[PDB]
Design a protein around this ligand. Sequence first.
Ligand SMILES: Nc1ncnc2c1ncn2[C@@H]1O[C@H](COP(=O)(O)OP(=O)(O)O)[C@@H](O)[C@H]1O
Ligand SMILES: Nc1ncnc2c1ncn2[C@@H]1O[C@H](COP(=O)(O)OP(=O)(O)O)[C@@H](O)[C@H]1O
Ligand SMILES: [Mg+2]
Ligand SMILES: [Mg+2]
Lengths: 412, 412, 405, 412, 149, 64
Amino acid sequence: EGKIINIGGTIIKARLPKARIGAFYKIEPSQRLAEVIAIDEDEVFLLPFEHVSGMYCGQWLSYQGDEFKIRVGDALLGRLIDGIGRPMESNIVAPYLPFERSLYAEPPDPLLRQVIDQPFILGVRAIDGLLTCGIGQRIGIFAGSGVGKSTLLGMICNGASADIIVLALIGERGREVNEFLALLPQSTLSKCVLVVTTSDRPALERMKAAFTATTIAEYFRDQGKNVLLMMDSVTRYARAARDVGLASGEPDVRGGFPPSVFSSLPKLLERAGPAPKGSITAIYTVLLESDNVNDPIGDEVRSILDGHIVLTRELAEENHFPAIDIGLSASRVMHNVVTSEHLRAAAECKKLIATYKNVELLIRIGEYTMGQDPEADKAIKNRKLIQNFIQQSTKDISSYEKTIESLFKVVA
Amino acid sequence: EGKIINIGGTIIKARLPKARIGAFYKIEPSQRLAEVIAIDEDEVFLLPFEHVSGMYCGQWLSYQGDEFKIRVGDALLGRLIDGIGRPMESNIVAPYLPFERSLYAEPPDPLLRQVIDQPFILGVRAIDGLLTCGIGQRIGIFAGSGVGKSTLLGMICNGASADIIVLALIGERGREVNEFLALLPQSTLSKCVLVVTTSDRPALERMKAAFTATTIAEYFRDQGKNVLLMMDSVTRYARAARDVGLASGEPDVRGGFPPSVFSSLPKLLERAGPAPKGSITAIYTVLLESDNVNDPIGDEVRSILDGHIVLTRELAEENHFPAIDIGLSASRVMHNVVTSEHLRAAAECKKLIATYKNVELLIRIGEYTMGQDPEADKAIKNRKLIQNFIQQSTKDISSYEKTIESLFKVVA
Amino acid sequence: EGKIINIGGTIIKARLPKARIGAFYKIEPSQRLAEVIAIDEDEVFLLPFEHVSGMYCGQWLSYQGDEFKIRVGDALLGRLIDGIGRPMESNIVAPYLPFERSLYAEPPDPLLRQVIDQPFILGVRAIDGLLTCGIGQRIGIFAGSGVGKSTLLGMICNGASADIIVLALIGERGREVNEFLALLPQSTLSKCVLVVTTSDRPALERMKAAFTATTIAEYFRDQGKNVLLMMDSVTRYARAARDVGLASGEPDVRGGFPPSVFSSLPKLLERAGPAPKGSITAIYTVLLPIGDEVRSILDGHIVLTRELAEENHFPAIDIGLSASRVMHNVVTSEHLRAAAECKKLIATYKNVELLIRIGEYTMGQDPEADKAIKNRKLIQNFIQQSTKDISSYEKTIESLFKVVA
Amino acid sequence: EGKIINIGGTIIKARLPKARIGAFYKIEPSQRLAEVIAIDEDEVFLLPFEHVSGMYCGQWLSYQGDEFKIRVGDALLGRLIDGIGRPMESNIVAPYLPFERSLYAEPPDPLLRQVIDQPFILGVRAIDGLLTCGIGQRIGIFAGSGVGKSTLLGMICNGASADIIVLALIGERGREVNEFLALLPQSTLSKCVLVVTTSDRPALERMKAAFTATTIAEYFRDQGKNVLLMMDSVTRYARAARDVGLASGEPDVRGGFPPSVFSSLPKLLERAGPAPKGSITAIYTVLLESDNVNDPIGDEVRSILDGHIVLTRELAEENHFPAIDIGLSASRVMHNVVTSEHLRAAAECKKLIATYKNVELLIRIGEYTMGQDPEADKAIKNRKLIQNFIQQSTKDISSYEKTIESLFKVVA
Amino acid sequence: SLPKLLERAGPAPKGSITAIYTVLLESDNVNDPIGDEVRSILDGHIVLTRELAEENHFPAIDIGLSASRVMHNVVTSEHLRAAAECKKLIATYKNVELLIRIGEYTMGQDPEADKAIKNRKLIQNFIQQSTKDISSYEKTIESLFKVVA
Amino acid sequence: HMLDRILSIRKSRANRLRESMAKINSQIKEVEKRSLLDSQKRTKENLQHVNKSVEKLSFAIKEH
Ligand SMILES: Nc1ncnc2c1ncn2[C@@H]1O[C@H](COP(=O)(O)OP(=O)(O)O)[C@@H](O)[C@H]1O
Ligand SMILES: Nc1ncnc2c1ncn2[C@@H]1O[C@H](COP(=O)(O)OP(=O)(O)O)[C@@H](O)[C@H]1O
Ligand SMILES: [Mg+2]
Ligand SMILES: [Mg+2]
């Protein structure tokens, strides 16, 4: 059909007359895949990802279709899937996947994507009492390393109020995926779909894994369920998309990232919102470093999402699990999700926490005693029960009405 | 009329001669369009309206009109428009829009523009009291990501008293269409045109929505009435123009940006403003890419607008809402629209906020004695009255008379 | 089989049809050789190993291969090998070598990595009393400059319970190969097969030395033998593969390294683990940008510090911030908890020596630091010994159990 | 045998079909030589030995040699040589050099190098008492501009005890050749060879003086005697080779430098050292671009060289000469050389210098009670003995026994 | 091409052009390439800072960063001395400003710091000026002599 | 950059004056205490003096 003309290291050219763009091809001697990214007159540029050094001048290509698809069906509940869309395991025969979806879809009509008003019950008393999620809210957890991101993340997986969970671990090593999917039980994995790819996989698969998980969750949305998508480490998606964009040839504009990363984040994670039939509540994670406090992916994800959680290292150094810094973190759709008395209670508890930080640094200074500030004294005497409300062990799962009841207790 | 010889991901090259620059074409086996960016001898470089991911080499371009023009009439009052110009509301019938006009018009004559001296009531108490606007100016709201821009536009749209309100939501979170639409009453939406494009839409439509919103505002200006143009993230226009310019082979000159961005911002931001017949008052939001006001596109937009409001995260995390930094924000018609005792009182309140910010460490650790500097004494005395004057809720809209009355009360 | 178009300093261009990337061709009049980095439609960018002087327009290129494979057999035990594979010296004659295998072999996926058992004894009594290591475990050593790591490597070659010991001096200095081999006996050299290469040598064979040593160690893995791989200065492999990468043409991403070394180093390191044929214990040294990427990729870091090596406490390892991640799957529960309580008995001395540098600390109620003061010297001569002081595994156990008393 | 087709600034290009690399040609109208550095299949890049005064197109070339060789011999002592090889003093009669050698030889067999065991008495108290050099060690001196690299080579070269000294002054001021001959006594000037090239000389004399000095050093090494080679700014070789190769069609890689610099510098810089008969001991002055840490030509010279003395100008600003930062400098070959008590004394007083460099702050800030840190109490008492042991005058050279005696009485 | 614009505006054999060029800096840094080059061409620079615009000190001229090349040929020796001593008072207060803001300054150690603290308000309402206000040159220099001592 | 180093001394001075405060508060229970409360009184006013010395030195980093 067409043969390789040259190999330029990471990008190859091949003569195919009237080849379309977005298509994917088989190298005929091996079984290797490569897509088309740029079209010339007769001699298309073409991006491989797996292996380059086994290539001649005149090695043949093979056509499959116009756009890359995946096999999606209702038998995926409890499967480790490749990021390109294949079942990784060989212990089971791949079941009946009837439908045929592409990875590039579009979000719904903005006049059909309507306002979110219902709460998303979560089990964690800090994310649900003081902050509050909504069914259609895209949370972003901004964590470091060693603060307890995965323990909180498994607490989200287990105690959620969702019907189908769709995890996505983009850049990982095998010990961490085994540690994390060994951390959540079989009652969780009987409803969970796992789109797992690791850091040894090539960059195209680590980029397509987010599209794969979003397409699985759009399918389980379109039958009318409350899907909970969990992209783990959108930072590593961004690193994969950086490498693909720089290998395509593209000038970096901010922090070493090409414009394709910054233009492909919104059309990735704007798909995961409310819909006219069912809805998807997504929760993304960003690994913030002390090396770059600037971190353009963190700023753009904060600019696209709506409601961020910050896991600080100080609240991990003193034993405060989960290490959620209330007041440094917030949710945007809370004022139209919770009731009015819960909204005036939760603001007073955050104001008590900030007032306690100020009053401890003014009480070790020598210039405080009890009686000349009423807002201070109530925070002083409510310190330990606020700390018993925020802190929560891994196997202590609470309900929503118990959380609101204990919150109304802990404010007054 | 001509074939395609290149498809490069953003710019497609077509071998078709005698093409006028600015003209647009239809890819005739589809229903998609493309606009001529540059020409060669017979090899034009043009930019598609929709995405590029379905095209191939020999694919014709039939000739369309010589310039892309939108259709505008009086029946746009109360509608939902895209950046191309076509209506979003499908269930609402198609209006009769008798006039049509292109998106690239010149500003008024610099002598026929007039010195602006009538105040524009915004409803926000801080801007009205310490800063203030004029009917005709172009103020701008500079902030980081998630600091309070969209909230302040909603507050300032419930507060404003214009004749026509043209709201452009450019490159923003698609959920928020119905939220901006549900914070407005019906008598406001009966006079409100709403141009909505989304962050998923390609780099032309997210770039060209500013010009169709400004063209609709110029139409209702030329009918002879004072209109209000609120634009949400002109920096998304700036990012779209960066991506189109760098795809079209232009050098980086500052911070990631080509010179075409810095040359194309002033004509967009300058065709607003005063006029011989009517006036459009514009309020643009600017997303500073870190939490710094000296971003490249933030500095370039600040050197063009006349009046700038700076929101800072250091007051967002202190629950000082709205987060208007009184120091780094200024209005360039303040001294021109208002009387002398209001100007004196506003300047003195700004100065005594600064002189409290001089002292507050000596108050915190208990060192400042009372009677030695009367300016700092009056600062410490009137702090709580000021920060009951500066903060206000989103539901609290205050008229201009009570604003200047409480301003005289608080300055003493 | 192809004429040379031009010479671009370190890049040759040739006119030859149908060659694969990585095929190595032969300068026929001078007996030098050069492998392919990129092909055009008929011309081919390749790069020479050796120096480029003496070459003209129109030299021939003999084909002689399509990918480089090393002539490896059972008779390489006790011989000096270049990073390419040919011997170093000419005093010895090359013996019979029946087999040859290529330098590439795909590792198993990380989702099904095996369990570790069967304690592997290195010889230094400090770690196999405190931070033990199994057969298929791959270990990273994070040491500095002038910390005495060469004696450590020579004494964990001397006293290891492995039938084959393979080491790759990849990128070493001129004197340092004799400086290293001066402290290996003959009973050790008759067990070693070892690859050396110097900074004189081109970056192409300085990065193929790692694949050569890994491939030879995989060959001796398949014969039912327990084999130990050593790669000294993985960072020098990293800078060599960097020089090959941006010498071929590639922009860098992190530090100064291209992403090709970030695609090749997990491929080089992810292999060489617990196979069912009797497996391959890898020890990889990294000096103190990519140490994060190495330290997050293999199980077990050993830290040698100058702040400890300024005294005469050799081997210069500090147990308070090094740990091998698999000990409960290796050593028994008694030995594990006794080793961990000796670790926290050492770690409480440095938080109480600084408080007994000042005159304040007494006894009376602190049951963990009062024991360190009396039982300090048994600790501090348990966790150090000389270069040719061997301590077997059935002595350090009861020695450690009479340390805890 | 060919015509010259263009003249650049540094480079010549000609049409010499089937010409070898290294083959040097002379220009037929104008007597001057030029050697081939690149091929472009019909069209060769030559580098001339002199300036380009009158160079018309089509100027002829004539075959002279296949490689460039220099005349060496034992009758070369007490003389001055340029980078090419010819004597530089002209009032003297021309000597008789018997043999010829090419400039490109290969380093010795690493299995046949000897083992460094005995010290090289250097003269400076710091690089004898703290960083002892062995006979056969390659050390380098790393500093910025005018920090004291050449003054330290004056102190070394004055008090050097080697059997024969080859001093290479590569690409530096013509003024200072007499200042080096002013501190060479007749006993060490009767056995010294100065290979001097000045910074105004053309590119390949400045590029080949290092090879000429190493060729002379290998000749007198192969006679059987140990020889001190001292290169002054091998960075001048590095940027001469940068300007040669980068203007010959070769890409920027790390600092403006081609790959050929990083290919040809570790072969030059390693053909010194031990040997089966004799030993070159080498001291390489290295100039740094900035005073930073990411210098593309300082870092890899630091990596491929066994021992390095780091001069920092922050000690040259407080007038602490020689400006050796003993924490930043190291000597890998001293633990094999000195006795064990010498190692203990060196490590102890390095520890004392490192302790006083931060106990000094809490002496000025009045927070240091005596006795609470005894080691610091030992680092304040012996501050003056250390700071007379470390820095010494230029004309103050001291023998090895006085250095070890003074080291012992400083540590005790 | 910037020196062959800026050098045409100066003294001349008949007539003169005194020119005043406004220069916008690409950040608040004065070491912008255009700011640096136009500072190396022109005969005097008046650097306005944003710190003094935030402190409501208008006009926001930073006196230490400013200079005027031709002043020593223009003013008398007494006026040049008074200008230099007033600029040294401004620099002394900028030295002691953060030390008195933290709270370590007790009145009495330095003789120049008490002079700076005492003449602070006179210097401030000399430098600070409203937009609709103009001074004559004799009132400016006599107010300078009254402020400086 | 060395002003970051000074509060590391100032905060460590605070820890070594509140652990000494815990020394006297542990031995006000056993008793001499009137002669021993003379030491905690100078301790706690110095601990207030050291805590004031940090909060005007940790706030002095933001001013630069
Ligand atoms: N004036 C205000 N009063 C109270 N909260 C506010 C105000 N402005 C912003 N916020 C907080 O910020 C969030 C919305 O910020 P927004 O202005 O939408 O950020 P952006 O400017 O990036 O769109 C809300 O969740 C709200 O709690
Ligand atoms: N050991 C020293 N004692 C006194 N002054 C020195 C010493 N070394 C350098 N200097 C001073 O520093 C300057 C740099 O000296 P030099 O050795 O020429 O530096 P370089 O050769 O590295 O440029 C000289 O002008 C000299 O006065
Ligand atoms: Mg917004
Ligand atoms: Mg010098």
